[PDB]
Amino acid sequence: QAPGNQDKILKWISTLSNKATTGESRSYCTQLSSLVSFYNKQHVEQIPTIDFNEWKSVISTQGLVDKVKENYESLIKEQYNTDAISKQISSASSKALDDIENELSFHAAIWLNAYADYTMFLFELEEYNDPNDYLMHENFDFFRGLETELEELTETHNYIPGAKDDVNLRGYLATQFAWGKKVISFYRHPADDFKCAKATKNMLGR
Amino acid sequence: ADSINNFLANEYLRLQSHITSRALNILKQAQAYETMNQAALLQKLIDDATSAIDN
Amino acid sequence: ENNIASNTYILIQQDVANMAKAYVHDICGYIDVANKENVRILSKGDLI
Numbered sequence A: 001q002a003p004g005n006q007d008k009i010l011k012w013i014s015t016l017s018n019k020a021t022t023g024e025s026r027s028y029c030t031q032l033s034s035l036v037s038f039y040n041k042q043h044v045e046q047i048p049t050i051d052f053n054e055w056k057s058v059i060s061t062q063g064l065v066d067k068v069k070e071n072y073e074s075l076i077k078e079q080y081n082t083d084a085i086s087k088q089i090s091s092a093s094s095k096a097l098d099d100i101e102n103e104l105s106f107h108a109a110i111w112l113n114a115y116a117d118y119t120m121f122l123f124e125l126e127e128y129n130d131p132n133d134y135l136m137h138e139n140f141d142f143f144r145g146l147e148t149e150l151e152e153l154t155e156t157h158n159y160i161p162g163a164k165d166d167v168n169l170r171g172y173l174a175t176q177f178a179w180g181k182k183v184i185s186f187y188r189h190p191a192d193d194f195k196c197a198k199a200t201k202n203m204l205g206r
Numbered sequence B: 001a002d003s004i005n006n007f008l009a010n011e012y013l014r015l016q017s018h019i020t021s022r023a024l025n026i027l028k029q030a031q032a033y034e035t036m037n038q039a040a041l042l043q044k045l046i047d048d049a050t051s052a053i054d055n
Numbered sequence C: 001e002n003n004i005a006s007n008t009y010i011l012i013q014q015d016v017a018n019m020a021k022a023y024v025h026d027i028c029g030y031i032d033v034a035n036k037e038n039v040r041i042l043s044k045g046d047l048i
């Protein structure tokens, strides 16, 4: 019982503390660690054995050594009822604790959904190889949704390539050696014209 | 669950040591008074002898 | 969606404040369990 029974309990508390960054959390970790050390403190003092016969013989008050023994033994029989406590702690505990039981459960479900997204993508990616070996309309079917977006660019007459793409990487590759190196402005439509004109005291609007 | 089981366990021993320690101190403490009563009784005998000399 | 004070459903755990706080409010509650047992056992009879 005494040795090796607290090793696992130290790894858990250590990680919980390492994850703590804000001072507020670190304080709660100190409180948590104290209670664990408080409950897990080991008691070893070599409980001495009482030889009532020895004291009874050397010297004692008549009826005292025997009265102490019978009363002493009666309390030694009493012991903790570990069973009752074992059940209550396992049945229900700290309805406030249920707050994070349901918070971390939903928090984990969010990031399990993301883990499945990345996992399933790498799974489907196994059958897709060598984009240069597929026809045009077949590649768009692997990447379902691009044809739909391509129709949106066409039906809105956004036929300037890369206008609605935040990083028109294809536009930078084509302009690596162009004169007046520039890429189309974001969301530029081939029909919009923001031109103005003014008349000043001078000519040419100057 | 393991912290509660180890708490009641070690706490059970502490109570056990408390009782036996109490039962042992009360016994030793009583013996101390018993020896004092014996010394007081014999001291009176010596006191009686000294008074007899004075008389 | 009813009993959690958060300004978004995109839950991101970057500290263990909410976790350790609920543990000290839980494991502490079960204090005095052994001392309470000692009351019954010791209040049973007087050694004397």
Ligand SMILES: CCCCCCCCCCCCCCCCCC(=O)OC[C@H](COP(=O)([O-])OCC[N+](C)(C)C)OC(=O)CCCCCCCCCCCCCCCCC
Pocket (backbone or CB within 6 Å): A178, A179, A180, A181
């Ligand atoms: C092939 C069959 C079909 C062909 C169809 C025609 C396709 C034409 C291909 C595109 C031609 C585009 C020419 C743009 C030239 C811009 C260069 C530039 O940015 O200047 C940078 C230059 C140079 O800067 P730079 O950094 O870009 O290049 C530096 C060059 N070196 C490396 C040599 C130093 O600086 C300037 O800003 C000067 C601007 C002068 C612009 C004069 C050109 C005006 C002509 C365009 C208007 C025409 C409208 C016609 C509308 C008709 C309607 C009826």
